[PDB]
Amino acid sequence: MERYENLFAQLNDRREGAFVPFVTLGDPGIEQSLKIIDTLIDAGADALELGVPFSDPLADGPTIQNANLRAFAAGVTPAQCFEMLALIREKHPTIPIGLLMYANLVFNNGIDAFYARCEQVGVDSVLVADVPVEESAPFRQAALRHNIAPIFICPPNADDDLLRQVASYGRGYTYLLSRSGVTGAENRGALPLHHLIEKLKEYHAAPALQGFGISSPEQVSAAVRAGAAGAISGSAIVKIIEKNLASPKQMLAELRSFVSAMKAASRA
Template sequence: MSRYTALFERLNAANQGAFVPFITIGDPNPAQSEQIIEALIAGGADALELGIPFSDPVADGPTIQDAATRALNSHTTTAICFDILSRIRAKYPDLPIGLLLYANLVYTHTPEDFFKKAKAAGVDSVLIADVPVEMSAPFKAAADQFGIESIYIAPPNADDDTLKRVAELSSGYTYLLSRAGVTGAETRAQMPVDHLLKALKEFGAPPALLGFGISEPEQVKAAIAAGAAGAISGSAVVKIIEHNLADPAAMLEKLTQFVKNMKAATLR
């Protein structure tokens, strides 16, 4: 059984949804980044969604772009990211760990080489933000070869054909966008996603996690009330990092508390 399947079964039995924080590995530097991941887990994160820093993150707003810049300026490489992931995996054998990244990072290796290294580091899933479903075949083939789950985005304006393709190809979970545009806590999540959730369920998609613009516990509650299996929050987490760069201890404390508050909102 995959770690995601086990997680969703356990949460359903406990009448809870999932809360999944996102950060960029290496932000603000590799050593602090590892402490940040530990703080998120200490706060009760059900799974992790982690970015590998990239110089042109087209799906991201300024907050996560700045995180990638900080990570790259501290000389974070893909190899360093995999080293950090290996250590986290060794400490937390049951925690689902997903990567969210861009195709160029895969192509600096080959898809096979990248997914092989990801598997060795303990990665469960990969979402490639700039590859649409119809162009994803070589990535999915490499992911399948190494037993890594392929995550696809279900956009808010998707027609049934797109949702059907997403449902057929996805495993682990489905990343449901709450709104169009780039990542960012400044633009709030929209919640009229009931029809999308219903369609994804009809097409047999894995559980949907709602992302983009999730920054408050009330939004997590609303996502779960609408039928999502949980919520992903990125920019709001990264803003805590950004606003506390001068005080690392306060940063870790605030991150843990933020996750605790968001996780508490997943109780059904």
């Protein structure tokens, strides 16, 4: 949690939004994934969203489905992912690390133990994609007990009650969904979110990051202009991985370029 508070405070001072890439851990292998993540950071990522490969990623479009599949083809397991996360935090003191989980991987060996492991390795937040606020109780309790921010989704059509729930229960950042559907750069969000962003601030919600379908610098700037604290980009990053599987050199170069450009767009 507190890594986010410090980041948001600092960005506030730097007059900048946060740019936050997503990748699947272990895609396309453990070693290449670690180098990918280091590159994201070096190129200007303000925080990370990291997916643990799961057999049933039902909020993800094909780009991320395929990322899940590539990690599985390299034999990547949650245990290996947690080793990766320990190493990532061992290298980088302050950057907020958030996991993108599905429920069964959290519940599998006990919800409390899951969040305890997260705390041990230095994770800052967890978003469980198939747990709605209605089911969130044991997840958010476990998270807070272990100093993990539980990340809640605010859909573009959220009603007042849902805004108040997300505002009260959330920590770290509030996930502002661009649109309905599943992750994917091929679908840009087309709903204005400034009313949600204002109401979340009124209710003292954690700062909002816009996510889903963000693939270009103009969208980062738009999110900041609408009042959001920053933006998350997943599919567009993962597409660069997919594109460059045959050339780790070109892969990192293109990741660096893309993240650099996207982070630059976050300057107010």
